[PDB]
From TrEMBL:
Lineage: Bacteria, Pseudomonadati, Pseudomonadota, Alphaproteobacteria, Hyphomicrobiales
Native source species: Agrobacterium fabrum (strain C58 / ATCC 33970) (Agrobacterium tumefaciens (strain C58))
Disulphide connectivity of cysteines: C107-C115
Protein name per its UniProtKB record: ABC transporter, substrate binding protein (Polyamine)
Gene3D superfamilies named in the record: Periplasmic binding protein-like II (3.40.190.10)
Matching Pfam families: SBP_bac_8
Origin: domain of life: Bacteria
Keywords: Periplasm, Signal
Length: 320
Protein backbone atom coordinates (compact mmCIF):
# COMPACT_ATOMS: atom_id res chain seq x y z
CA UNK A 1 0.00 0.00 0.00
CA UNK A 2 1.39 3.45 -0.98
CA UNK A 3 1.84 5.97 1.87
CA UNK A 4 0.87 9.62 1.15
CA UNK A 5 2.93 12.53 2.58
CA UNK A 6 1.46 16.06 2.41
CA UNK A 7 3.55 19.19 2.96
CA UNK A 8 3.97 22.82 1.82
CA UNK A 9 5.40 22.18 -1.67
CA UNK A 10 8.52 23.87 -3.01
CA UNK A 11 12.04 23.32 -1.67
CA UNK A 12 10.88 22.26 1.83
CA UNK A 13 8.70 19.41 0.51
CA UNK A 14 11.47 18.50 -2.05
CA UNK A 15 13.97 18.21 0.83
CA UNK A 16 11.51 16.07 2.85
CA UNK A 17 11.00 13.81 -0.19
CA UNK A 18 14.80 13.35 -0.69
CA UNK A 19 15.73 13.01 3.04
CA UNK A 20 12.65 11.08 4.30
CA UNK A 21 10.39 9.54 1.60
CA UNK A 22 13.28 8.16 -0.42
CA UNK A 23 15.08 6.73 2.64
CA UNK A 24 11.77 5.20 3.83
CA UNK A 25 11.19 3.55 0.40
CA UNK A 26 14.80 2.21 0.26
CA UNK A 27 14.48 0.90 3.86
CA UNK A 28 10.95 -0.64 3.82
CA UNK A 29 9.93 -1.04 0.18
CA UNK A 30 6.77 1.05 0.89
CA UNK A 31 6.41 3.69 -1.87
CA UNK A 32 5.70 7.28 -0.69
CA UNK A 33 3.57 9.59 -2.83
CA UNK A 34 3.79 13.37 -2.50
CA UNK A 35 0.63 15.47 -2.16
CA UNK A 36 -0.38 18.88 -0.93
CA UNK A 37 -0.09 21.70 -0.28
CA UNK A 38 -1.15 21.17 3.37
CA UNK A 39 -4.76 22.37 3.63
CA UNK A 40 -6.58 22.19 6.97
CA UNK A 41 -10.04 22.26 5.38
CA UNK A 42 -9.06 19.24 3.24
CA UNK A 43 -7.61 17.38 6.27
CA UNK A 44 -10.87 18.11 8.21
CA UNK A 45 -13.13 17.03 5.24
CA UNK A 46 -11.12 13.75 4.66
CA UNK A 47 -11.34 12.77 8.37
CA UNK A 48 -15.07 13.58 8.70
CA UNK A 49 -15.90 11.58 5.53
CA UNK A 50 -13.78 8.54 6.69
CA UNK A 51 -11.95 8.98 3.38
CA UNK A 52 -8.43 9.71 4.59
CA UNK A 53 -6.02 10.09 1.57
CA UNK A 54 -3.13 11.80 3.46
CA UNK A 55 -1.25 9.55 5.89
CA UNK A 56 1.50 11.90 7.21
CA UNK A 57 0.98 15.70 7.01
CA UNK A 58 3.46 18.48 7.77
CA UNK A 59 1.33 21.13 9.59
CA UNK A 60 2.10 24.31 11.55
CA UNK A 61 2.81 23.61 15.24
CA UNK A 62 -0.14 25.76 16.45
CA UNK A 63 -2.54 23.86 14.11
CA UNK A 64 -1.20 20.49 15.52
CA UNK A 65 -1.87 21.77 19.11
CA UNK A 66 -5.43 22.75 18.14
CA UNK A 67 -6.32 19.71 15.93
CA UNK A 68 -5.33 16.96 18.42
CA UNK A 69 -7.92 17.90 21.13
CA UNK A 70 -10.52 18.29 18.31
CA UNK A 71 -10.32 14.57 17.34
CA UNK A 72 -8.89 15.18 13.84
CA UNK A 73 -5.69 13.22 14.43
CA UNK A 74 -4.50 9.74 15.37
CA UNK A 75 -2.74 9.44 18.67
CA UNK A 76 0.96 8.81 17.81
CA UNK A 77 2.63 5.48 18.70
CA UNK A 78 5.55 6.33 21.02
CA UNK A 79 6.81 2.71 21.04
CA UNK A 80 7.55 3.19 17.23
CA UNK A 81 8.44 6.92 17.47
CA UNK A 82 11.14 7.38 20.12
CA UNK A 83 10.15 10.66 21.80
CA UNK A 84 13.20 10.57 24.15
CA UNK A 85 15.49 11.96 21.38
CA UNK A 86 12.88 14.56 20.22
CA UNK A 87 12.66 18.27 21.18
CA UNK A 88 9.92 18.09 23.90
CA UNK A 89 8.70 21.64 22.99
CA UNK A 90 7.05 20.16 19.84
CA UNK A 91 5.70 16.88 21.12
CA UNK A 92 2.01 16.22 21.92
CA UNK A 93 -0.05 12.96 22.08
CA UNK A 94 -0.93 13.65 18.41
CA UNK A 95 2.22 15.28 17.02
CA UNK A 96 6.00 15.56 16.95
CA UNK A 97 8.16 18.36 15.50
CA UNK A 98 8.88 18.20 11.74
CA UNK A 99 11.49 21.03 11.90
CA UNK A 100 11.89 24.30 13.80
CA UNK A 101 13.34 27.72 13.27
CA UNK A 102 13.95 31.07 14.91
CA UNK A 103 12.77 34.46 13.68
CA UNK A 104 15.90 36.63 13.87
CA UNK A 105 16.78 40.22 12.94
CA UNK A 106 18.56 39.97 9.57
CA UNK A 107 20.29 42.95 7.92
CA UNK A 108 22.01 43.86 4.64
CA UNK A 109 25.08 45.60 6.32
CA UNK A 110 26.42 47.61 3.35
CA UNK A 111 22.99 49.03 2.42
CA UNK A 112 22.38 50.74 5.80
CA UNK A 113 24.35 53.08 8.11
CA UNK A 114 23.68 50.66 11.08
CA UNK A 115 21.94 47.32 11.80
CA UNK A 116 18.95 46.96 14.20
CA UNK A 117 19.96 44.65 17.08
CA UNK A 118 16.71 44.15 19.02
CA UNK A 119 12.97 43.95 18.23
CA UNK A 120 12.77 47.48 19.77
CA UNK A 121 15.38 48.65 17.18
CA UNK A 122 13.54 46.89 14.32
CA UNK A 123 10.42 48.92 15.29
CA UNK A 124 12.45 52.14 15.67
CA UNK A 125 12.14 54.03 12.37
CA UNK A 126 13.67 57.23 13.84
CA UNK A 127 16.93 55.37 14.67
CA UNK A 128 16.78 52.71 11.86
CA UNK A 129 14.91 54.27 8.93
CA UNK A 130 13.40 52.60 5.89
CA UNK A 131 11.55 49.48 4.85
CA UNK A 132 11.51 46.42 7.12
CA UNK A 133 10.23 42.98 6.20
CA UNK A 134 8.01 40.57 8.20
CA UNK A 135 6.16 37.29 7.58
CA UNK A 136 2.84 37.93 5.75
CA UNK A 137 0.80 35.04 7.15
CA UNK A 138 -1.14 34.97 10.41
CA UNK A 139 1.20 32.85 12.54
CA UNK A 140 3.40 32.97 15.66
CA UNK A 141 6.17 35.56 15.39
CA UNK A 142 5.23 39.10 14.35
CA UNK A 143 2.76 39.78 17.21
CA UNK A 144 5.28 38.53 19.79
CA UNK A 145 8.04 40.65 18.15
CA UNK A 146 5.79 43.81 18.30
CA UNK A 147 5.06 43.21 21.99
CA UNK A 148 8.72 42.54 22.92
CA UNK A 149 9.68 45.67 20.88
CA UNK A 150 7.09 47.59 23.00
CA UNK A 151 8.81 46.50 26.26
CA UNK A 152 6.76 43.41 27.16
CA UNK A 153 9.08 40.99 29.03
CA UNK A 154 9.33 37.44 27.60
CA UNK A 155 8.04 36.02 30.95
CA UNK A 156 4.82 38.13 30.76
CA UNK A 157 4.34 37.83 26.96
CA UNK A 158 1.36 35.39 27.10
CA UNK A 159 -1.65 35.83 26.82
CA UNK A 160 -0.79 38.23 23.99
CA UNK A 161 -2.07 41.79 24.41
CA UNK A 162 -3.46 42.12 20.83
CA UNK A 163 -4.50 45.81 21.03
CA UNK A 164 -1.01 46.71 22.28
CA UNK A 165 0.66 44.62 19.50
CA UNK A 166 -1.43 46.12 16.69
CA UNK A 167 -0.89 49.67 18.04
CA UNK A 168 2.88 48.97 17.97
CA UNK A 169 2.70 47.49 14.41
CA UNK A 170 0.65 50.59 13.36
CA UNK A 171 3.62 52.85 14.30
CA UNK A 172 5.72 51.25 11.50
CA UNK A 173 2.98 49.94 9.16
CA UNK A 174 3.73 52.17 6.14
CA UNK A 175 7.35 50.85 6.25
CA UNK A 176 6.48 47.13 6.29
CA UNK A 177 7.04 45.03 3.15
CA UNK A 178 5.62 41.54 3.72
CA UNK A 179 7.54 38.33 2.82
CA UNK A 180 5.26 35.40 1.81
CA UNK A 181 8.01 32.79 1.39
CA UNK A 182 11.69 32.19 2.30
CA UNK A 183 13.20 33.05 -1.12
CA UNK A 184 11.21 36.34 -1.24
CA UNK A 185 12.61 37.32 2.23
CA UNK A 186 16.11 36.75 0.80
CA UNK A 187 15.37 38.79 -2.37
CA UNK A 188 14.01 41.69 -0.23
CA UNK A 189 17.10 41.82 2.04
CA UNK A 190 19.71 41.09 -0.74
CA UNK A 191 18.21 43.77 -3.09
CA UNK A 192 17.98 46.25 -0.11
CA UNK A 193 14.26 46.77 -1.05
CA UNK A 194 13.76 45.96 2.70
CA UNK A 195 17.32 45.88 4.08
CA UNK A 196 16.34 44.43 7.45
CA UNK A 197 13.54 42.30 8.83
CA UNK A 198 12.32 39.42 11.01
CA UNK A 199 13.30 36.34 8.94
CA UNK A 200 13.83 32.57 9.32
CA UNK A 201 17.41 32.16 10.69
CA UNK A 202 18.39 29.69 7.91
CA UNK A 203 17.65 32.22 5.15
CA UNK A 204 20.54 34.46 6.46
CA UNK A 205 23.06 31.59 5.63
CA UNK A 206 22.36 31.50 1.85
CA UNK A 207 22.61 35.31 1.90
CA UNK A 208 26.09 35.07 3.55
CA UNK A 209 27.16 32.33 1.02
CA UNK A 210 25.81 34.27 -2.03
CA UNK A 211 28.25 37.16 -1.31
CA UNK A 212 25.84 39.61 0.37
CA UNK A 213 27.43 41.04 3.57
CA UNK A 214 24.85 40.40 6.28
CA UNK A 215 24.45 40.63 10.07
CA UNK A 216 22.03 38.61 12.20
CA UNK A 217 20.96 39.58 15.67
CA UNK A 218 19.70 36.69 17.86
CA UNK A 219 18.50 39.03 20.69
CA UNK A 220 15.09 37.64 21.86
CA UNK A 221 15.01 35.28 18.80
CA UNK A 222 11.52 33.72 18.51
CA UNK A 223 11.18 29.97 17.93
CA UNK A 224 8.22 28.20 16.32
CA UNK A 225 7.93 24.86 14.48
CA UNK A 226 6.08 22.64 12.07
CA UNK A 227 4.81 19.22 13.16
CA UNK A 228 4.11 15.80 11.68
CA UNK A 229 0.57 14.46 12.28
CA UNK A 230 -1.47 11.48 11.07
CA UNK A 231 -5.14 12.27 10.14
CA UNK A 232 -7.68 10.21 12.16
CA UNK A 233 -8.91 7.36 9.97
CA UNK A 234 -5.71 6.79 7.86
CA UNK A 235 -5.81 3.36 6.13
CA UNK A 236 -1.98 3.20 6.63
CA UNK A 237 -1.54 3.80 10.39
CA UNK A 238 1.39 1.40 11.05
CA UNK A 239 3.34 2.69 7.99
CA UNK A 240 2.55 6.34 9.01
CA UNK A 241 4.08 5.77 12.49
CA UNK A 242 7.19 4.11 10.92
CA UNK A 243 7.50 7.03 8.43
CA UNK A 244 7.34 9.53 11.33
CA UNK A 245 9.95 7.53 13.32
CA UNK A 246 12.29 7.66 10.27
CA UNK A 247 11.60 11.39 9.53
CA UNK A 248 12.38 12.33 13.16
CA UNK A 249 15.53 10.14 13.47
CA UNK A 250 18.92 11.81 14.08
CA UNK A 251 20.25 11.32 10.49
CA UNK A 252 16.94 12.14 8.68
CA UNK A 253 16.61 15.35 10.76
CA UNK A 254 20.32 16.22 10.12
CA UNK A 255 19.70 15.75 6.33
CA UNK A 256 16.46 17.79 6.24
CA UNK A 257 18.16 20.60 8.34
CA UNK A 258 21.25 20.69 6.07
CA UNK A 259 19.08 20.91 2.95
CA UNK A 260 16.57 23.54 4.20
CA UNK A 261 18.43 25.72 6.71
CA UNK A 262 15.70 24.78 9.24
CA UNK A 263 16.77 23.45 12.65
CA UNK A 264 16.49 19.71 13.51
CA UNK A 265 13.93 18.50 16.10
CA UNK A 266 16.09 15.48 17.13
CA UNK A 267 18.57 16.39 19.93
CA UNK A 268 21.25 14.05 18.40
CA UNK A 269 21.18 15.62 14.89
CA UNK A 270 23.51 18.61 15.45
CA UNK A 271 26.43 16.19 16.26
CA UNK A 272 25.96 14.54 12.80
CA UNK A 273 25.93 17.77 10.81
CA UNK A 274 28.73 19.89 9.34
CA UNK A 275 30.15 21.70 12.46
CA UNK A 276 30.01 25.02 10.49
CA UNK A 277 26.18 24.50 10.19
CA UNK A 278 25.78 23.10 13.77
CA UNK A 279 27.33 26.38 15.11
CA UNK A 280 24.61 28.45 13.29
CA UNK A 281 21.69 26.53 14.92
CA UNK A 282 19.10 28.18 17.26
CA UNK A 283 20.21 25.76 20.07
CA UNK A 284 23.51 27.71 20.25
CA UNK A 285 21.38 30.90 20.87
CA UNK A 286 19.09 30.02 23.86
CA UNK A 287 20.39 33.00 26.01
CA UNK A 288 17.41 35.39 25.47
CA UNK A 289 15.43 33.01 23.19
CA UNK A 290 11.65 33.32 23.25
CA UNK A 291 9.68 30.12 22.59
CA UNK A 292 6.36 30.88 20.86
CA UNK A 293 3.44 29.39 22.81
CA UNK A 294 1.71 26.78 20.54
CA UNK A 295 -1.03 26.28 23.17
CA UNK A 296 -1.91 30.00 23.25
CA UNK A 297 -1.96 29.93 19.40
CA UNK A 298 -4.01 26.71 19.40
CA UNK A 299 -6.70 28.58 21.41
CA UNK A 300 -6.67 31.84 19.37
CA UNK A 301 -5.42 31.16 15.79
CA UNK A 302 -8.83 31.42 14.06
CA UNK A 303 -9.71 34.82 15.67
CA UNK A 304 -6.15 36.21 15.26
CA UNK A 305 -6.26 35.18 11.58
CA UNK A 306 -9.47 37.08 10.89
CA UNK A 307 -8.31 40.23 12.72
CA UNK A 308 -4.84 40.00 11.11
CA UNK A 309 -5.94 40.07 7.43
CA UNK A 310 -8.50 42.86 8.12
CA UNK A 311 -5.68 44.91 9.80
CA UNK A 312 -3.02 44.06 7.14
CA UNK A 313 -5.03 45.72 4.32
CA UNK A 314 -3.08 48.68 2.79
CA UNK A 315 -6.18 50.89 2.96
CA UNK A 316 -9.06 51.23 5.36
CA UNK A 317 -12.40 49.88 4.18
CA UNK A 318 -15.61 49.03 6.02
CA UNK A 319 -16.46 45.30 5.41
CA UNK A 320 -20.24 45.98 5.61
Amino acid sequence: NDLVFSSWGGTTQDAQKAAWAEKFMVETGINVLQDGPTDYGKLKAMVEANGVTWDVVDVEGDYAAQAGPKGLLEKLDFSVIDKTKLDPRFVTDYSVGSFYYSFVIGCNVDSVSACPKSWADLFDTAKFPGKRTFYKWSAPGVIEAALLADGVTADKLYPLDLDRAFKKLDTIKSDIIWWSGGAQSQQLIASAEAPFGSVWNGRMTALEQSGVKVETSWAQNITAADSLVVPKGTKNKDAAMKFIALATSAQAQADMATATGYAPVNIESAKLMDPKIAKSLPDQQTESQVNADMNYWAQHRDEIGERWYAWQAKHHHHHH
